[PDB]
From Swiss-Prot:
Homodimer. This is Protease 2A. It catalyses: Selective cleavage of Tyr-|-Gly bond in the picornavirus polyprotein. It comes from Coxsackievirus A16 (strain G-10). The lineage of its organism: Viruses, Riboviria, Orthornavirae, Pisuviricota, Pisoniviricetes. The active site is at residues 15, 33, 104. Cysteine protease that cleaves viral polyprotein and specific host proteins. It is responsible for the autocatalytic cleavage between the P1 and P2 regions, which is the first cleavage occurring in the polyprotein. Also cleaves the host translation initiation factor EIF4G1, in order to shut down the capped cellular mRNA translation. Inhibits the host nucleus-cytoplasm protein and RNA trafficking by cleaving host members of the nuclear pores. Counteracts stress granule formation probably by antagonizing its assembly or promoting its dissassembly. Zn(2+) 1 binds at residues 50, 52, 110, 112.
């Protein structure tokens, strides 16, 4: 679990969005596993606007932060789960690191700010949904 709070927006994994997230929907994209909802309070976070490929992510299954080198956002095949059929997820970045399903929502950050959130994983792999292209989050 986990979310990004910037301005009057809350960014979450679309597969973990609540009834309240859907009732205050701003934008969602099943192909990116992202959902953004509106908030009444002003949010705590800043979004990176960069091309960093190194950063640090929070891993809830270890209560620890880990450094990672990650690929550029791309279209990656993702196996079928209880939430989605087998499909290509877009704007996804992969890295070597520990992750478990409950780790989705953990923030990936670089020196410039929030880069994205955990969205997929595998045997010694972890995937992050990029948010750096969503320029409207800052306005
Ligand atoms: C951090 S999530 C994770 C981690 C390790 C895992 N190992 C083995 C198998 C699955 C793992 C898994 N789950 C995962 O990738 N998906 C299920 C939830 C929705 C995700 C999506 N964005 O389509 C795909
Ligand atoms: Zn950066």
């Amino acid at each position: 679990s986990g979310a990004i709070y910037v301005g009057n927006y809350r960014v979450v994994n679309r597969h973990l969005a609540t009834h309240n997230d859907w009732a205050n929907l701003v934008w969602e994209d099943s192909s990116r596993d992202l959902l953004v909802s509106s908030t009444t309070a002003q949010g705590c976070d800043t979004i990176a606007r960069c091309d960093c490929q190194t950063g640090v992510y929070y891993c809830s299954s270890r209560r620890k932060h880990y450094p990672v080198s990650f690929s550029k956002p791309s279209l990656i095949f993702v196996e079928a789960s209880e939430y989605y059929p087998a499909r290509y997820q877009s704007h996804l970045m992969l890295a070597v690191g520990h992750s478990e399903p409950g780790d989705c929502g953990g923030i990936l950050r670089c020196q410039h700010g929030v880069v994205g959130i955990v969205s997929t994983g595998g045997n010694g792999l972890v995937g992050f949904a990029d948010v750096r292209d969503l320029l409207w989050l800052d306005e």
